[PDB]
């Protein structure tokens, strides 16, 4: 499989404006009939090359006439002497049924259902199957009415009719011009649910929200959540819904999260399927999360799309954005951006730090599924937020107003995005762009001075980019800079210079450089890089006292969290060398004290307060060391936990009953006091034992919703309590025949502590309710062992690495997208140890080694043992 370049795009020699297709259903054998209408841009001597896979080739006309002039090719069908317009038909058969790999057109239970992102629809016909090429589709299907009684794709219905021998059809146009990725289509039969929202213009909309048969009672949630979402996205960026019908459809076999199909978005079911004894609060906010992605795509992938999938993160790190906004506005901002950043150091940096390093616009892909990533989303919003941080919101959204004026309708790059923000705003982004075309985490390096002769504050701030093995070559970024500086009674100090104000973002644009500030009345301590005001690591030697300082007088909850982080990764830090020399924790007492504090606090945020009795994961603790040494990490977030919930014993218990509610709602009030209680609860099950298996057992069985009955279970799990396995069995025995409730067990049992950990997850492979069919199932048990299990995953007889290859050489034939997600754990070798790499390079050596080998893992092994 050969690389492709971003340096190398150029527009294509042809294109299609409309497409007519025909899509004769039926699960072994679908004849897909594609007429489209070209149009020759390049030379006469230019064939037309249309991407293809897995096509059963069975005619091809140009108007009308049967052609000879034509050759198929490694994944193409090569069209010659052509004129420059004209009309191309394609007749070819494609079988749902026999695709495993979920994309194209396949079957999901009984349904039929697409995914053509990135490139799935040249497994459907010959096409240009490019984003740069924008048509307008008109989609006919037709198909069995009993087995297929609901027949939908984008846009509009505009006819329909009954045949002979039990069989409808239903056609579909969509006026807006589409590159292919974002058609879909959908047979089956539903339950719907059907609602309707009126746009602040008075445009109707009708909703329609397609679940499996029994399902409707799960359905509402999601429902309005899009209705929330199209509120906000006319409320907070002045855009309106610009059709008549919005689709929704559920599917339980489904590669991605969701996807923003025009009109017809398709979910995984996990994304909308929702009820208070099925779905976690994290469930309500997740379905809220991605419904809004889906629908804020309309405008930010769909009016305004990506002229090749090197610009992936023009909609993704925007549309991520926009999702963020979302949830912040309407539920805690704070809460948001505590976890946001959680995600950005404690998994994108590794990321950002592995053989799959690479920038938010990538310049080389091998397999364009995977740069689905942190980085091209999670960092690629950083990127974002940082423009906006530069702008303020004001001119935020008259760059956005811009860039849809000089954009809508057509396809356009990452560039394109950045200079309609410039334009708009007069903010300089030539430095800025960078954050484009550079990969890795910057680390910037602060050092401070306090001068009371003169009353002035100096900060000399530097910054570095560590090499990546995808670039030798990095340069200084322009990061916008947040500082806060607090006077002895926690009341900020104005920042100004020689009598002028000075702006509390700095602009950090070389290598080093150095700000003074005057009238610092006394001597600071200083917030710093604010709200996370770029994606970097911040090197400052802080003083424990200045830490416990900000999380009592900080302005921003989010300084009063990164405070709490920054006193905790000191520690972690300790008790991690300690335990490798076969000593027990050791802790200040001024630590346990400033935690203490945060419990007894009356006046502080509950959300807030969860937060910071949250430690941090187990992935985020290891972007603390250059070697990790997983068991080490593990066992002291274990003794971290035992030592704190022995300490905090009778505060962590009264803070449990004082936040017990006896309603259970999905409001963000209610949702941090049961934040609160269940962050209580799981020290609690780490302190003396019979206590703990009352408290714990108890709440299981007293529980009104999945939040607190998951939260005990997960607990009894975790500490390993008397209660654990008859716990584990009634739920089961309640749940085994829901998936999506059963995928919260599977990961139980994947990240449980417990020594014989791998001996369960290889027997589950036979549970009742796992299937290696179904990506869900696949991501609850195996990947959830394998990323989320690092202690075990990397038991040093190299166990874990064995299973993994053993189920990667399944899933690279069978799915090769689960396949690839899956792989990550290992393509991490060199943070490793010595031991570790050489069992950890042989699985990969294994895996190279397979006879027909996926593109999508060659790419990833390949990089991984260069
Ligand atoms: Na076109
Ligand atoms: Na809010
Ligand atoms: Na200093
Ligand atoms: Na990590
Ligand atoms: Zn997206």
């Given at each position: 499989p050969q690389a492709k370049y971003r340096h190398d795009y150029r527009a294509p020699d042809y294109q299609i404006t409309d497409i007519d297709l025909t899509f004769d259903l039926d699960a072994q054998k679908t004849v897909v009939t594609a007429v489209s209408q070209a149009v020759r841009h390049?030379?006469?001597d230019a064939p037309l090359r249309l991407n293809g896979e897995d096509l059963k080739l069975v005619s091809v006309h140009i108007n009308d006439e049967p052609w000879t002039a034509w050759k198929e090719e490694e994944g193409a069908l090569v069209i010659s002497n052509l004129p420059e317009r004209f009309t191309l038909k394609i007749i070819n058969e494609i079988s749902p049924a026999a695709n495993?790999?979920?994309?194209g057109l396949y079957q999901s239970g009984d349904a039929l259902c697409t995914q053509c992102?990135?490139?799935?629809?040249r497994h459907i016909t010959y096409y240009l199957?490019?984003?740069?090429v924008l048509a307008r589709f008109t989609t006919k299907i037709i198909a069995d009415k009993i087995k297929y009684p609901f027949l939908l794709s984008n846009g509009n219905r505009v006819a329909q009719g009954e045949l002979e021998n039990g069989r409808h059809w239903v056609q579909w146009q969509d006026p807006f011009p589409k590159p292919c990725y974002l058609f879909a289509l959908v047979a089956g039969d539903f339950d719907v649910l059907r609602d309707t929202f009126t746009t602040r213009s008075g445009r109707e909309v009708a909703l329609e929200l397609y679940v499996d048969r029994?399902?409707?009672?799960?359905?509402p949630w999601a429902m309005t959540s899009l209705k929330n979402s199209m509120k906000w996205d006319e409320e907070r960026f002045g855009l309106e819904y610009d059709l008549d019908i919005y689709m929704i459809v559920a599917v339980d076999?489904?590669?991605?999260?969701?996807?923003?199909?025009?009109?017809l978005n398709i979910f995984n079911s996990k994304y909308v399927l929702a009820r208070t004894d099925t779905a976690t609060d994290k469930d309500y906010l997740d379905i809220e999360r991605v419904i809004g992605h889906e629908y804020f795509?309309?405008?930010?992938?769909?009016?305004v799309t990506c002229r090749?999938?090197?610009?992936?993160?023009?909609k993704e790190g925007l549309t991520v954005f926009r999702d963020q906004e979302f949830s912040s506005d309407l539920g805690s901002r704070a809460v948001n951006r505590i976890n946001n950043v959680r995600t950005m150091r404690g998994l994108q940096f590794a990321e950002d730090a592995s053989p799959m390093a690479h920038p938010?616009?990538?310049?080389?892909?091998?397999?364009?599924?995977?740069?689905?990533?942190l980085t091209v989303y999670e960092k690629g919003a950083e990127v974002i937020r940082m423009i906006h941080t530069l702008l303020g919101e004001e001119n935020f959204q008259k760059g956005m107003q811009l860039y849809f004026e000089r954009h809508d309708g057509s396809a356009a790059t990452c560039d394109d995005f950045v200079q309609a923000m410039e334009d708009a705003?007069?903010?300089?982004?030539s430095h800025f762009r960078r954050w484009y075309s550079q990969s890795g985490t910057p680390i910037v390096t602060v050092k401070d001075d306090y001068n009371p002769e003169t009353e002035q504050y100096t900060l000399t701030i530097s910054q570095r980019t560590p090499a990546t093995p995808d670039q030798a070559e990095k340069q200084p970024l322009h990061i916008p800079f947040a500082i806060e500086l607090y006077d002895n009674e926690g009341k900020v100090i104005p920042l100004q210079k020689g009598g002028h104000p000075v702006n509390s973002?700095?602009?950090?644009?070389?290598?080093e450089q150095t700000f003074v500030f005057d009238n610092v009345y006394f001597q600071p301590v200083p917030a710093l890089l604010?709200?996370?005001?770029?994606?970097v690591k911040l090197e400052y030697k802080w003083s424990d006292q200045q830490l416990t300082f900000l999380m009592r007088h900080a302005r921003n909850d989010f300084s009063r969290w990164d405070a709490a982080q920054s006193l905790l990764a000191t520690y972690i830090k300790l008790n991690v060398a300690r335990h490798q020399q076969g000593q027990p924790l050791s802790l200040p007492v001024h630590v346990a004290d400033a935690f203490r504090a945060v419990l007894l606090?009356?006046?502080?945020?509950p959300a807030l307060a969860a937060e910071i009795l949250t430690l941090p994961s187990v992935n985020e603790m290891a972007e603390?060391?250059?070697?990790?040494?997983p068991i080490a990490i593990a066992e002291v977030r274990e003794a971290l936990t035992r030592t704190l919930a022995t300490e905090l014993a009778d505060e962590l218990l009264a803070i449990y009953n004082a936040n017990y509610q006896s309603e259970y709602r999905v409001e963000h009030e209610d949702i941090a006091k049961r934040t609160l209680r269940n962050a209580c609860l799981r020290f609690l099950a780490f302190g003396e034992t019979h206590l703990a298996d009352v408290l714990v057992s108890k709440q299981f069985h007293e529980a009104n919703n999945m939040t607190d009955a998951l939260a005990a279970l997960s607990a009894a799990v975790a500490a390993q309590l008397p209660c654990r396995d008859a716990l584990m069995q009634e739920y089961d025995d309640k749940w085994h025949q829901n998936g999506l409730v059963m995928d919260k067990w599977f990961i139980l049992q994947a990240t449980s502590?417990?020594?014989n950990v791998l001996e369960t997850v290889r027997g589950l492979?036979?549970?009742?309710?796992?299937?290696?069919?179904?990506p869900n199932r696949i991501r609850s048990l195996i990947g959830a062992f394998a990323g989320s299990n690092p202690a075990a995953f990397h038991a040093e007889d190299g166990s874990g690495y064995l299973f993994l290859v053993e189920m990667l050489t399944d899933l690279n034939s069978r799915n090769p997208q689960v396949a690839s997600r899956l792989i990550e754990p290992l393509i991490?070798?060199?943070?490793?140890?010595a031991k570790r790499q050489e069992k950890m390079r042989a699985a990969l050596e294994q895996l190279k080694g397979?006879?027909?080998?996926?593109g999508d893992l060659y790419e990833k092994i390949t990089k991984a043992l260069a």
């Open positions: 390049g030379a006469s495993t790999a979920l994309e992102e990135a490139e799935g629809f199957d490019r984003p740069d029994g399902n409707l009672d799960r359905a076999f489904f590669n991605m999260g969701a996807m923003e199909n025009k009109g795509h309309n405008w930010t992938g769909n009016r090749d999938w090197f610009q992936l993160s023009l938010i616009r990538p310049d080389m892909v091998i397999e364009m599924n995977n740069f689905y990533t705003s007069n903010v300089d982004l973002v700095l602009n950090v644009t070389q290598a604010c709200e996370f005001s770029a994606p606090d009356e006046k502080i945020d603390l060391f250059d070697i990790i040494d502590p417990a020594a492979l036979q549970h009742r309710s796992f299937t290696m069919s179904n991490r070798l060199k943070r490793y140890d397979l006879e027909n080998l996926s």
